[PDB]
Design a protein around this ligand. Structure first.
Ligand code: S7U
Ligand code: S7U
Ligand code: CL
Lengths: 305, 306
């Protein structure tokens, strides 16, 4: 029993974290085989950020301008190239701790673990979700750029996020490991803002199934709804529309509790229209939306890596 | 910016997790140097758990009755001993991945990271706190016994918890790494229940200071309170008494924000009376109590967003 915001074990990623310094800018890099991946803004001064021409800044750099530190060892950069908003530094040493990995781009609503790093040294691990507005509600201070987000499947690390920036509302933005931003963000010090966000409906339903598995049933009722009628309510409360794909994905949780998805949707409709009436669900007074259906199945089954 | 329930990176502990099997019972062990530490109830059947005589069950075992698996390698047990509620299995191989470590027994209110494991394989990492009733609100299924709790302040792992049991209310109990239980619990299936739990007041105050550091002050008020009047009020909401030690520990957070501890206590008294009125604090509609003053200083910026 119990239900916690659980992250994947971070050891396989810890063994990849390095420090990258270019001039007075220092941030984190990901060392996989003989390449170190990091945000391309490592080559910018504060003045450059206002309007950087990354190709023009990069052409003026030599390999020896990049200082890469792995623990207490200095790696030698022997090549450099840019891929979208990521810089790839070819080094003379292959990482002996390179895990089996893939670079994957995730969709809004998906969750991942973040290994927060400073000066190439891991500081903590936490779980988060790619918001529908393509931001993440992370916990990052200056120096955390280059920290990565990931998921694990058996022995394979799927890297999905690299940290680049904080927005005025205190939320975060970054790219996949191919350097493509999530969201309409750019790597420059210019006016940028998080768009209006919505609640991830399929994840709230998954967490209500988690509450049922753990013994919280007070919110269940005799009613059902159609997908069309439920979505009228979702639109009214700033919830994402629920699709037939979301209903299908909830199938295993619906089967393991005996509660049809549309039956759980009628419970969610009443919770939105009336509130919790002084009660909590899994120790929360808010409807939690950062657990996917797979996260619920994995935590309620004991899947290992 | 931001504020999350953050665990320590788990790699140093992952390299210590092994599987221990005795007959049909299988659970996790912690392999440090040439010793594997695990719950002594690995030698029990379900029937034995009502009134176990651990000494009598253990004397009938040889070293080769204990199967220890580290990854895909079988370790050889060359000695065994019982220390309180833990079994210490001496093995013929020292763990090459043993980190710098210490065994520390913690007090209620302290937090730690848990590396949940099954069959000697890590499944996830999460943060928790030792509750005032000496239980933890973990996430553990059957097979998770032997999973450990730890902190990693300055590259040394401080192991503070080993998982042994789930209570009828769904909360968890376990020991320090010397096998001494936290709380009045026994590794026997007895009518033992979690005592009435209370909120960790010093941690709620720390989290209110975290909210101020991150730029929010809506909950502050123009009042102060004495320590005794605050305790008289807080205990009516099942909050733990706040001591002068707790006030002292909040000193650095009080200094970074310019808000005296007793003035933050007055704010907490008002939040207990009024609730949040549709507002949230650091993305929560409840008063959070599983962040210590040390955790807030560890995670938050050293510069308040004034
Ligand atoms: N709004 C806002 C801010 C960020 S900023 O405006 O100073 N900023 C714009 C920017 C734009 C694009 C890119 Cl690619 C990078 C960046 C930078 C580069 C430096 C590191 N950083 C930070 C990243 N993460 C967490 C931060 C926590 C405090 C400080 C800076 C942080 C950035 O966001 C700077 C003040 C919180
Ligand atoms: N109430 C209750 C229970 C526990 S029990 O009654 O089955 N139980 C009594 C007991 C007494 C003392 C000691 Cl030291 C150990 C144990 C055991 C040993 C086996 C593993 N286990 C478990 C430990 N952690 C998480 C569990 C999640 C589901 C199942 C069992 C779990 C225990 O608690 C068994 C049913 C949740
Ligand atoms: Cl302590």
């Amino acid at each position: 029993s119990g239900f916690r915001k659980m992250a994947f074990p971070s050891g396989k990623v810890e063994g990849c974290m390095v420090q990258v310094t270019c001039g007075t800018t220092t941030l984190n890099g990901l060392w996989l085989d003989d390449v170190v991946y990091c945000p391309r803004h490592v080559i910018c001064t504060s003045e450059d950020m206002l309007n950087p021409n990354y190709e023009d800044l990069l052409i003026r750099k030599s390999n020896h301008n990049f200082l890469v530190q792995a623990g207490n060892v200095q790696l030698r950069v022997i090549g450099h190239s840019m891929q979208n908003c990521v810089l790839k530094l070819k080094v003379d040493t292959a990482n002996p701790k390179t895990p089996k990995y893939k670079f994957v781009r995730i969709q809004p609503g998906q969750t991942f673990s973040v290994l927060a790093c400073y000066n190439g040294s891991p500081s903590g691990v936490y779980q988060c979700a790619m918001r529908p507005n393509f931001t993440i509600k992370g916990s990052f201070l200056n120096g955390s750029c280059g920290s990565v987000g990931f998921n694990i499947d058996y022995d394979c690390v799927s890297f999905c996020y690299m940290h680049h920036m904080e927005l005025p509302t205190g939320v975060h933005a970054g790219t996949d490991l191919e350097g493509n931003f999530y969201g309409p963000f750019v790597d420059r010090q210019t006016a940028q803002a998080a768009g209006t966000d919505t609640t991830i409906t399929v994840n709230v339903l998954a967490w209500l199934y988690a509450a049922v598995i753990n013994g919280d049933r007070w919110f269940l009722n005799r009613f059902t709804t159609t997908l069309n009628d439920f979505n009228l309510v979702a639109m009214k409360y700033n919830y994402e529309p629920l699709t037939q794909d979301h209903v299908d994905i909830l199938g295993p949780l619906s089967a393991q509790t005996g509660i049809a998805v549309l039956d759980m949707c009628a419970s969610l409709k009443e919770l939105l229209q009336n509130g919790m009436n002084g009660r909590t669900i899994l120790g929360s007074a808010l409807l939690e939306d950062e657990f996917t259906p797979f996260d619920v199945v994995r935590q309620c089954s004991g899947v290992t890596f």
